[PDB]
From a paper:
Before the glycosidases can act, the terminal glucosamine of HS must be acetylated by the integral lysosomal membrane enzyme heparan-α-glucosaminide N-acetyltransferase ([name]). [name] catalyzes a unique transmembrane acetylation reaction where the acetyl group of cytosolic acetyl-CoA is transported across the lysosomal membrane and attached to HS in one reaction. We find that a central pore within each monomer traverses the membrane and controls access of cytosolic acetyl-CoA to the active site at its luminal mouth where glucosamine binds. A histidine-aspartic acid catalytic dyad catalyzes the transfer reaction via a ternary complex mechanism.
The GlcN moiety’s interaction with the luminal cavity formed by the ECLs is mediated mostly by polar interactions, including with the proposed catalytic residue H29711,17. R372 and E499, whose mutations lead to low activity and mis-localization of [name] in MPS patients, bind to the 6’-OH and 3’-OH of GlcN respectively. We observed slightly different configurations of the active site between the two monomers where one monomer appears to have bonding distances better suited for catalysis than the other, suggesting that the two monomers may be in active state asynchronously.
Numbering used by the authors:
A (entry chain A): 76 to 170, 176 to 228, 265 to 663
B (entry chain B): 75 to 170, 177 to 228, 265 to 399, 407 to 663
Write the structure that this text describes.
Amino acid sequence: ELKMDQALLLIHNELLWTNLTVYWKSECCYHCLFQVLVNVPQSPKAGKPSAAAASVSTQHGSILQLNDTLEEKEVCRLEYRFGEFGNYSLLVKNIEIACDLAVNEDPVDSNLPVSIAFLIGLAVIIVISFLRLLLSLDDFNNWISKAIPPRLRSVDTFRGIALILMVFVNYGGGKYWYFKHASWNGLTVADLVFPWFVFIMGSSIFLSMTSILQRGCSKFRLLGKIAWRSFLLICIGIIIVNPNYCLGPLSWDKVRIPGVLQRLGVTYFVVAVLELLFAKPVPEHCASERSCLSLRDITSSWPQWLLILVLEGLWLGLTFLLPVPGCPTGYLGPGGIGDFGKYPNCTGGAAGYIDRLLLGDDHLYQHPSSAVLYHTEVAYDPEGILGTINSIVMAFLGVQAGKILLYYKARTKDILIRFTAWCCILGLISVALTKVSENEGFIPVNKNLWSLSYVTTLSSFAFFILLVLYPVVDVKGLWTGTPFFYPGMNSILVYVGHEVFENYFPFQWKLKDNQSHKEHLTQNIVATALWVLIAYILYRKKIFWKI
Amino acid sequence: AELKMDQALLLIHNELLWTNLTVYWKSECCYHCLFQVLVNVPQSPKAGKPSAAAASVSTQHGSILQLNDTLEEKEVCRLEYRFGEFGNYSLLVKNIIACDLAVNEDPVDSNLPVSIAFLIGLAVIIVISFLRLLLSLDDFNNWISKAIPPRLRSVDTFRGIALILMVFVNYGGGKYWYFKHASWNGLTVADLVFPWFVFIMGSSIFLSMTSILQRGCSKFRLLGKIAWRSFLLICIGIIIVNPNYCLGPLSWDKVRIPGVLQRLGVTYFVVAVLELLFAKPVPSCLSLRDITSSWPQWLLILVLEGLWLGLTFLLPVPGCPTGYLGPGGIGDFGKYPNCTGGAAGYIDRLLLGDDHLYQHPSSAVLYHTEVAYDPEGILGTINSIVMAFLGVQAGKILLYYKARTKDILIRFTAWCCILGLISVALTKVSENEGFIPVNKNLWSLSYVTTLSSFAFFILLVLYPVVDVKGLWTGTPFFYPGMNSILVYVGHEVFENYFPFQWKLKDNQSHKEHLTQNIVATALWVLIAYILYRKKIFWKI
Ligand SMILES: CC(=O)SCCNC(=O)CCNC(=O)[C@H](O)C(C)(C)COP(=O)(O)OP(=O)(O)OC[C@H]1O[C@@H](n2cnc3c(N)ncnc32)[C@H](O)[C@@H]1OP(=O)(O)O
Ligand SMILES: CC(=O)SCCNC(=O)CCNC(=O)[C@H](O)C(C)(C)COP(=O)(O)OP(=O)(O)OC[C@H]1O[C@@H](n2cnc3c(N)ncnc32)[C@H](O)[C@@H]1OP(=O)(O)O
Ligand SMILES: *[C@@H]1O[C@H](CO)[C@@H](O[C@@H]2O[C@H](CO)[C@@H](O)[C@H](O)[C@H]2NC(C)=O)[C@H](O)[C@H]1NC(C)=O
Ligand SMILES: Cc1cc(=O)oc2cc(O[C@@H]3O[C@H](CO)[C@@H](O)[C@H](O)[C@H]3N)ccc12
Ligand SMILES: Cc1cc(=O)oc2cc(O[C@@H]3O[C@H](CO)[C@@H](O)[C@H](O)[C@H]3N)ccc12
Ligand SMILES: *[C@@H]1O[C@H](CO)[C@@H](O)[C@H](O)[C@H]1NC(C)=O
Ligand SMILES: *[C@@H]1O[C@H](CO)[C@@H](O)[C@H](O)[C@H]1NC(C)=O
Ligand SMILES: *[C@@H]1O[C@H](CO)[C@@H](O)[C@H](O)[C@H]1NC(C)=O
Ligand SMILES: *[C@@H]1O[C@H](CO)[C@@H](O)[C@H](O)[C@H]1NC(C)=O
């Protein structure tokens, strides 16, 4: 009867001279038009009020505006938050007319009941099952006999955490609203992994390129390697990751040109080529002081910083200045019914227009993140053309983190000072941009547009994560990234694998109740743990696929 | 138009007045098919103007049209014809009871013109495209530079040929009827692949066991390797290869336990454990010592063959004749609607259930069988083991007389002749008649002997040319031969992916399907070649 995060609302109209219409709009909508929930009729006779059944969304909040089809006057505005499976009864009576809320069945309290208790129980059960399976393997072997520079590992732990979170939220994340990507604006747990992947990509770009150059290899061989790696990423993404082959053979008239791997390849090429051309040897003798307050890692890359600033200015100018036909200039909203629905075919503004012009409507993402909340009827691709500038900026921030990590290697206090300084600077910039509020600010945090505040917020998060991880996993040694670094070293293999093997049995099976959050959560956690186990097994076999 | 692929539009005109003629159709190749109703032709309203009926006769190979009156059923005209693709044939039955077969539009061959000269044309096209891609890609790099224990390779070539055939016929094989699996009895191009894979599997089993036992190891880590490889093959077959995950998530109640890789794993375990349990070291014009040293496993193979024969021809099956080999459905005059496989089908449905079996057997499209019958069932694994052991015998022949090439060809010719004689004795040189007709779905003993004789002849041809005389390394073939498992898993996983599958301008065209499948097979050969160059052979 009811679906996930969907309370059942019954409207009892005790009125006898009005045809009430209940409207609806979530709290998380910024400026959304009210959608008709159900059209309750008037009571034919006194004593027996007219009733109708409506299913209200539970994910986050609910605004119910009561209007009558005759005069269109707000008899009462009710603003509540519903539960996952709740028999809610709304009665409105003339006393003038006030609508009161009654609960006939208590909600399941989605994400309230599971909390950390169910997660700990599931983890214990999975660990016990794995240990029992491992012990059973030795039982068969016994019965048969009876019968007859190195890797940082902190960047690796960072990438492993990002990969685990990405595998969890890509498989559904328990079908929870906050483990999915945000509709248009703000941040969720699924909006963090991709920026961290670009950050780590830039960091590893600098680490690998400087290792290769100081190992005595020509810059042209590295240029060829970079070009081949970016081309392979783009082709792999376009041919394998982007299209859903369960719907039929791939036709060029509906091929999704831009994607996650295409974005990664393009920004890899751009920022890696920037580093290659403007490559200076890593200074070593300069690290002779104690906690040196030198800006060497920044002033040694003034041309790349100038190019990055020019690119960021280009992104800001195109976003806020490019005149989109039939659209306000500098439009950042979601379109659809968002922003009071006055721009329905304007999902993404300048970035969406650039994508639709250069690549066409059919070569974009047909199911954007905003399509489920703001009801966008057009196609917008989060990995568009305009957002690649901000992805390049993020990759260069990762490059800066790598320069911090390598220029000062012996002085771990210097590394921590630089990480804290950069995290604070980027956090202050993000707070200034987004104005702390989710939907307010000059450039609100947005994954779909890859907003500048999105880049800065996620880069500050990445700098803080590196600040926490580098001493613990490298200097102090209190933790080896025990379950995380195997995905860190098999990132590309795990990404291609889980984007290819989404529907295979160990990662996805038929569920007893498809509308249960706990069943989906168990399936997604088991699938993520199995991908970690696969990465660990390949680590033991020393099978590291690299492009 | 409304005509499909491999179908012909048959217009029927009845000049008869007091007739309610119905047209019954039955494909020529079916052994004993009930005449299904094709179309119902109504009585002509008046003289001069006959009633017209539109039908699509399956022109894959032949068609039998029988016309008997609807009321007081009596045949008025029995017509046998071999229709052509996209043919507009008009049937004119007129009162004189006479028949006419006027061809209103000439048929399109779509088989000779596409697979006779268009095959060579497409080969030239793909060769030119590959050469241009190789030259242009290196030209750009050159512009920048200017500006600034041994493997035999015969078994490898055999396995590569089998892999090329499997990739071609698994993708559709041009959607031709002879590049698919024959509906129950008979041998097609697609039926030749799996038995050769089992044969090569057994040959490689012996060729690896001999090397390992001669080197430093024991028959206790070899047993672990064999058991783990069998378990891995079975698990891969159950999880990855078998289910069609595009439909939805896997479920226990509707998961297909049998499979190609499950069958390969079970037969590998059985035959490899047999050789390990009876492992002897290698030591001749007519020595025959290879068949005598391996006498216990030959005795066990004969016992297993007797068991398969006894279960097939003697196991009682409820609601089914004892010793049934027929396809069921409308086959055998439809007297056994649900008897697909007989003993093998009943054993599968009794041990694994009817939901853990192949729901689209090759007999469904022609004999109209509604039950689920799995070609890789439980009964046929005995014959899979027998053919794997014939491959093991080929390996023993090849390894025992390594320095006596003439001995190798003498033994290969002798074994091929013996197995061919056994096959022609069992099938009486007829696909549907005989004692044990050739059948992939039952994995018949005559199927095993025929395909093993074919494999022995293929080895007899390949071994001198590719090993002894050295005239031709298996240049377009052994590259998949060295990556078989990866190639199989890859084309099972990446069936729908762009290089191997793209949307066609008209899905009802044999030329477009053939070119797409040839391009896909060539791309898989190219992938295997690239992996060979980089030495990324995946094993176990
Ligand atoms: C939002 C959602 O829900 S979807 C989330 C989106 N998901 C994704 O984008 C996942 C896909 N991306 C990825 O898997 C990765 O980011 C990749 C593969 C594209 C790039 O990973 P990278 O950071 O380039 O690392 P990778 O493992 O490929 O190695 C690249 C180079 O960096 C080097 N490197 C990596 N880590 C380190 C380290 N810690 N120290 C030193 N060198 C390192 C490697 O040695 C290699 O150089 P080499 O070949 O010369 O030896
Ligand atoms: C009919 C249709 O359309 S669908 C049916 C078609 N599909 C199938 O049959 C499934 C696909 N099958 C296959 O890919 C293969 O048959 C496999 C992988 C299952 C088995 O291949 P095999 O012949 O066993 O060889 P594989 O490469 O796996 O290695 C087996 C062993 O034989 C050895 N070997 C292989 N070829 C040779 C050779 N020519 N000489 C000596 N030893 C050899 C290998 O070295 C290996 O031993 P090792 O572990 O010491 O290295
Ligand atoms: C529900 O009723 C209220 C009040 O009747 C509507 O509020 C006004 O509606 C008129 C249109 O009749 C608009 O011109 C006004 O701008 C609205 N606001 C105010 C403050 O007057 C409300 O629009 C109705 N709901 C919907 C979905 O239209
Ligand atoms: C749920 C899901 C199923 C699937 O079959 O695979 C996915 C792949 C995903 O990845 C995202 O997909 C969109 C465009 O690719 C963008 O929202 C993001 O940028 C990108 N990280 C996200 C979700 C899924
Ligand atoms: C169509 C298809 C696509 C693919 O990519 O994979 C296949 C693999 C096939 O092989 C057959 O599959 C069945 C066993 O699973 C049995 O009909 C036969 O024994 C076996 N020859 C046949 C068809 C396909
Ligand atoms: C309410 O709508 C019904 C039809 O659905 C109509 O018969 C009735 O007159 C309406 N009442 C008012 C007060 O408009
Ligand atoms: C909800 O409650 C009402 C009365 O309180 C009852 O009639 C109805 O059956 C209930 N529905 C569900 C789904 O529990
Ligand atoms: C058509 O009629 C003839 C009349 O004897 C009969 O023998 C034949 O079986 C009929 N065809 C059917 C029933 O398919
Ligand atoms: C077959 O020929 C008839 C001639 O009477 C014609 O009307 C019909 O359209 C033809 N079929 C097709 C598919 O064109």
